[PDB]
Curated annotation (Swiss-Prot), chains A, B:
Assembly and interaction partners: Homodimer.
Chief localization: cytoplasm
Alphabetical list of HAMAP family matching this protein: URO_D (MF_00218)
Catalyzed reaction equations: uroporphyrinogen III + 4 H(+) = coproporphyrinogen III + 4 CO2; uroporphyrinogen I + 4 H(+) = coproporphyrinogen I + 4 CO2
Subcellular location: Cytoplasm, Cytosol
Variant or mutagenesis effect after changing I250T: In FPCT; decrease of activity
Pathway membership: Porphyrin-containing compound metabolism; protoporphyrin-IX biosynthesis; coproporphyrinogen-III from 5-aminolevulinate: step 4/4
Encoding gene (name): UROD
Designated name of the protein: Uroporphyrinogen decarboxylase
Residues binding coproporphyrinogen I: R27, A29, R31, R40, D76, Y154, S209, H329
GO BP: any one term: heme A biosynthetic process
Chain's role: Catalyzes the sequential decarboxylation of the four acetate side chains of uroporphyrinogen to form coproporphyrinogen and participates in the fifth step in the heme biosynthetic pathway. Isomer I or isomer III of uroporphyrinogen may serve as substrate, but only coproporphyrinogen III can ultimately be converted to heme. In vitro also decarboxylates pentacarboxylate porphyrinogen I.
Length: 356, 356
């Protein structure tokens, strides 16, 4: 692999001082880009995921528009449950869908042994290697996967939900089966994430998107242990393979209640949603971890000038140490690319000015 | 009106010591009750709201099953935007719906002057008077309305949403029009809430259900000021009318970030979702306000024995002072009435035992 030229994102991730704050955006490869819609219209959702060249292209697109300090591989969190044997039908503009969700304990028999998942996800590894080569060391490449609890919500709910009532019903009524499902997911995720690093990912993000549906007690029993397991095991496996460990990010959307624990869970970086004040997030996490976030993505509907001001305030609150700028959630498909660029430019410009 | 016999809920609400912890459940009148479905099947959603006798009946139903320490009038938060002139079409098992949401500033012209809303909501006042008479002083009757921001989300989104992207787009792109809408809502809510008290409500809850979509900054500009306004103005109007002010509850679902402010917003009681640890909620609010909540409603899917234990832990954490037991969100329609009764019984039984 080519020698990484700009490693600001990695340095910030490990806690080191940098000359400016690095920035990237969740869903930077997303429908808000016309060219994204265009190269997606040639296939269908999970078919695009299967073409290394197509995934590489989607990954690169935002980097041609904006001087982002990292690329994130284009994929979907749902590729893991799919690799586990669940059928997906992402259909006429409706998004994530399992037409046959898991509903009882017996449904667990449908799933592949987690030890074979990595071999099912070979196309992802190929896309990562290809992208790492094509980026030619411009900026680091992030790999990613959904956290076990979050993947479980999708597998049980069948898609998105406002309450996770079915998934939480499993936790309360089927605690043993739930732990089994969560361990299967963990055991699939670890080789998948190691594989992404072996293929060339330089950092990893674990996306616990459905954290906030759980209170502290449920989260500590059913989400946290597996989050800790993933980092511990990925790190162990990488060491033993003779490879360097990469910075790992845990993002728990709506996980204000778990920030303290999440700073102790084995991740270099804790990603935040926009509902936590940066100064309060810093109190919760301490001085030991890097923070990532947390601009309300809807803030990008504001004027370019307003975005600039909202960024200035955000950076003032986080301070220059142990910080990666990002949004608090993925970019929405109706957002203006010019406003995305305004956000990237304001982070770079203000963070330098703040250092002066 | 008949002399209130059991006023435990009111005493707890004002901060006074009580012999046991009072308990009620958000949506205690809801589809989880077979008899609720039955008496609803005779009309349609907002037609039921319009029959004083029907609303009274739905209100009373849960009190026949469970020794709840308060009744809450059956209504919908959406009756206010409807009274403002928006058409509702709650249709074949899909829930809240405005087929013609507000989408631009010009749409504000569609709405009635907020000063006439109270006269449009006469049916609610009639249902409250009737229910207060029929309850015959058994327990206090709570009136309620949605908070201005929450009602705005419904009016702009057209119903439920996972992102409130359209509503938050108004805040960012149309801040003046948004403040106008929020003031209209405030100005409609104040006479409506005063009217509920004049008709016989003994407490009031303001439901800020869509709080958590906002971060601290947006919330402080667009949600908090109106929340403060509602309490101040309702209290003022009631004093001037020669009436006693009633305990007021602010419930902000997913509003962990605003708890400190909400304790200063003029409400006797702050209601919590299940994502805040009770002990941390007590730190945020201080010793000046009563707290209400906060059992994860999904916890009721657990065994009766497990519910008992989860309640014991919850009460241990809140302590016996300045506390009203409730769930952290409304009861879900697939829940078992026997498990609801288990929750009510465990709160009473443990809170007495805890006092011994």
């Amino acid at each position: 692999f080519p020698e990484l030229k700009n490693d600001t994102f990695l340095r910030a991730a490990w806690g080191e001082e940098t000359d400016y704050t690095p920035v990237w955006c969740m869903r930077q490869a997303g429908r808000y880009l016309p060219e994204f819609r265009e190269t997606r219209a040639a296939q269908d959702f999970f078919s695009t995921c299967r073409s290394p060249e197509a995934c590489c292209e989607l990954t690169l697109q935002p980097l041609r528009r904006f001087p982002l300090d990292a690329a994130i591989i284009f994929s979907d969190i749902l590729v893991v449950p799919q690799a586990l044997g669940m059928e997906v039908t992402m259909v006429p503009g409706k998004g994530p869908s399992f037409p046959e969700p898991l509903r009882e304990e017996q449904d667990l028999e449908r799933l592949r042994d987690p030890e074979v998942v990595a071999s099912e996800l070979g196309y992802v590894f190929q896309a990562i290697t290809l992208t790492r080569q094509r980026l030619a060391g411009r900026v680091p490449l992030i790999g990613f996967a959904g956290a076990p609890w979050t993947l479980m919500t999708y597998m049980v709910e069948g898609g998105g939900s406002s309450t996770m009532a079915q998934a939480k019903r499993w936790l309360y009524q089927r605690p043993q089966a739930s732990h089994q499902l969560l361990r299967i997911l963990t055991d699939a995720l670890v080789p998948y994430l190691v594989g992404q690093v072996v293929a060339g990912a330089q950092a990893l993000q674990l996306f616990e998107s459905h954290a906030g549906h759980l209170g502290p007690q449920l989260f500590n029993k059913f989400a946290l242990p597996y989050i800790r397991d993933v980092a511990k095991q990925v790190k162990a496996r990488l060491r033993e393979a003779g490879l360097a460990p990469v910075p790992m990010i845990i993002f728990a959307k709506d996980g204000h209640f778990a920030l303290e624990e999440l700073a102790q869970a084995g991740y270099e970086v804790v990603g935040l949603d926009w509902t936590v004040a940066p100064k309060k997030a810093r109190e919760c996490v301490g001085k030991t971890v890097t923070l990532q976030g947390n601009l309300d993505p809807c803030a990008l509907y504001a004027s370019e000038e307003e975005i600039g001001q909202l960024v200035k305030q955000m950076l003032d609150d986080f301070g220059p140490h142990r910080y990666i700028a990002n949004l608090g959630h993925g970019l929405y498909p109706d957002m203006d690319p010019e406003h995305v660029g305004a956000f990237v430019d304001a982070v770079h410009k203000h963070s330098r000015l703040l250092r002066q």
